[PDB]
Structure 1
Amino acid sequence: PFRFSPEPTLEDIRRLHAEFAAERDWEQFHQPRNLLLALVGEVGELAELFQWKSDTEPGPQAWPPKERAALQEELSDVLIYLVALAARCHVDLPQAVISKMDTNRQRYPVHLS
């Protein structure tokens, strides 16, 4: 029975990789397009970090640790870069996901009997 955590708000993640990006190259960790391509590669490194695994064979948890480790890393990074972008676009991801979900919930009526 694995959950995540309530905190940090998404708000707050928007928080940590902004002051964080501030003590570093501005246009670098500041061009949305830098953070995005940073994410795509990360979503990219994740792809490969699952490229030859069997949709079946010992999943993420049943591997060496430098793997779940980094796999957990490309995940953390895809999200950090997802969060940093969103922030920059002043998109309120928390609210955006909502109707997206409320919207997706619509478009896709559930199927009873």
Structure 2
Amino acid sequence: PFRFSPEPTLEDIRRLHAQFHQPRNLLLALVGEVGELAELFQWKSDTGPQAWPPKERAALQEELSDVLIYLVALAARCHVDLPQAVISKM
């Protein structure tokens, strides 16, 4: 069916990519990848990404992770328990 791999956990990805990496420089880099990610959708239409050519799907996973990696970074530097902070909202 569909499923995410049991790891790397949010804690791994935090440990793994970790001056640049200060607060608002990281927030501008998050918005950037959201900018690349948003680009792989602009000239589409309502119909999904599960059926895109390979070089596209491949970029769809690439840019998507990038965003995570920075959101990861940004929060791990704002000292927010990204993982827990999620369930609390639930």
TM-score when scaled to structure 1? 0.72
In 2, the alpha carbon distance for the partners of 1:55 and 1:88 equals 37
Q: What is the Cα-based RMSD across aligned positions, in Å?
A: 2.1
Distance (Å, rounded) in 2 between the aligned partners of 1:43 and 1:98: 24
Q: Which runs of 4+ in 1 moved over 4 A?
A: none
Q: CA separation in 1, counterparts of 2:51 and 2:87?
A: 34
Query: What is the deviation of 1:19?
Result: 13
Distance, in Å, in 1 between the alignment partners of 2:55 and 2:19 is 29
Overall identity of the aligned pairs, in % = 99
Counterpart-to-counterpart distance in 2, 1:11 and 1:99: 17
User: 5+ unaligned residues in a row in structure 2: which ranges?
Assistant: none
Deviation at 1:64, TM superposition (A): 2.2
The residue matched to 1:6 in structure 2 has which SS? coil
Deviation at 1:100? 1.3
**Separation of aligned partners in 2, 1:19 and 1:93:** 22
Larger Cα-atom Rg: 1
1:43-67: per-residue Cα shift (whole Å, max 9, x none)?
Answer: 11111110111121xx223222121
| C-alpha distance in structure 1 between counterparts of 2:19 and 2:32, whole Å | 23
- Cα 1:45–1:12 change in 2 (3 A) is same
CA distance in 2, matches of 1:99, 1:61: 31
> Structure 1: which 5+ residue stretches go unaligned?
21-29, 102-113
The one of the two structures with greater contact order (alpha-carbon pairs below 8 A, sep at least 6) is: 2
Number of residues paired by the alignment?
90
Name the CA shift for 1:62/1:19 in 2 (closer, same or farther; >3 Å). farther
What's the offset of the Cα at 1:31?
1.6
CA distance in 1, matches of 2:7, 2:32: 26
Shift of 1:78: 0.6
User: How big is the shift at 1:11?
Assistant: 1.0
